[PDB]
Amino acid sequence: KSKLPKPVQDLIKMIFDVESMKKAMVEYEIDLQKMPLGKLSKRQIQAAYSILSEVQQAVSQGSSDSQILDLSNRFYTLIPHDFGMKKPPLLNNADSVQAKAEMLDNLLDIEVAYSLLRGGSDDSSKDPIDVNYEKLKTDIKVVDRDSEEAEIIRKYVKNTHATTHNAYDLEVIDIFKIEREGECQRYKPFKQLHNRRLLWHGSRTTNFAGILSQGLRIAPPEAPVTGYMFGKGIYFADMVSKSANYCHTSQGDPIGLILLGEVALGNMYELKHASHISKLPKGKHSVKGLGKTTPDPSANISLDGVDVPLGTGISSGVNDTSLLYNEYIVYDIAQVNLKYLLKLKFNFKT
Ligand SMILES: C[C@]1(c2nc3cccc(C(N)=O)c3[nH]2)CCCN1
């Protein structure tokens, strides 16, 4: 039997749950009879991204519905969808491309989780929780609820829940301090960079085995750059609720996971509207999508020499922006050092 703390054991059980992976796939309209969890491969997902890029080229070139039909059909051939003997809906716009790009990002992490579960050794004398913990190559510790780091984290959660995201409230269940093997070494060129911030990253529970084993990643070269507001980078928020929305929790699944990462932002390229970029302008280290609301800058605190924007939301003074809240994007995976993982209970008021 495992000697790991019970919250860590529960975390391991949640992220390696095969039934949750199947549920995420069903939620995406994937046909599990034609494409089961065991049949998903990087190769297949990459080919589907490539086809999605062919679809975005046709939609931006102003091709007709009759013209896009074969391209749309091609995507469904690669990623079978649950439509029986009926015709699938046509993928003929930016919204459908974005929705499918997001789905493939999820399938990529699910494939990683399933590969870990299948690519190791079998020893019934060992607790499978300990076995699965070892596959993450991540030191996971429970943060003491009475510690200063827990107090700062709780304040960050308490103060940055947006009024527009009030259909639920958040209860912090557990706070974990995480250390991905080799990440400290990888982050070394950015460890003293100016404008290092502690930011939120929300994701579906089914993506966490991938995130902990591989770190936060950028969509592959095959992925459509127009499938993401600021292109192919790693996205963070300074508002807990903005990132919590990306956990995709519900009344039937109200427990989610959120990350706190130290992000080396450096010289920020400030944008108010979509810019589908792959690379940054010279001398820029990140993109800051300017929100109408920002955490109060006077309330900014330092945790282990990193800025924590835990102030309550105030007007940024930014006019005519597509964003209600800030978002930060890095285009080099080495600019992220994951620090904490929170298990949240979503209390839906609706
Ligand atoms: C829509 C998209 C995304 N935009 C975000 C902005 C702020 C935070 C997050 C997050 N996950 O915490 C975001 N995720 C684009 C790339 C992945 N999904």
Author numbering: 662 to 1011
Question: What do the study's own words say?
Answer:
Poly(ADP-ribose) polymerase 1 (PARP-1) is a highly abundant, chromatin-associated protein that is a key early responder to genomic stress in eukaryotes. Upon sensing DNA damage, particularly single-strand breaks (SSBs) that are the commonest form of lesion, it becomes strongly activated, catalysing addition of poly(ADP-ribose) (PAR) to nearby proteins, including itself, and thereby signalling for assembly of downstream DNA repair factors. A key component in transmission of the allosteric signal is the HD subdomain of CAT, which alone bridges between the assembled DNA-binding domains and the active site in the ART subdomain of CAT. Here we present a study of isolated CAT domain from human PARP-1, using NMR-based dynamics experiments to analyse WT apo-protein as well as a set of inhibitor complexes (with veliparib, olaparib, talazoparib and EB-47) and point mutants (L713F, L765A and L765F), together with new crystal structures of the free CAT domain and inhibitor complexes.
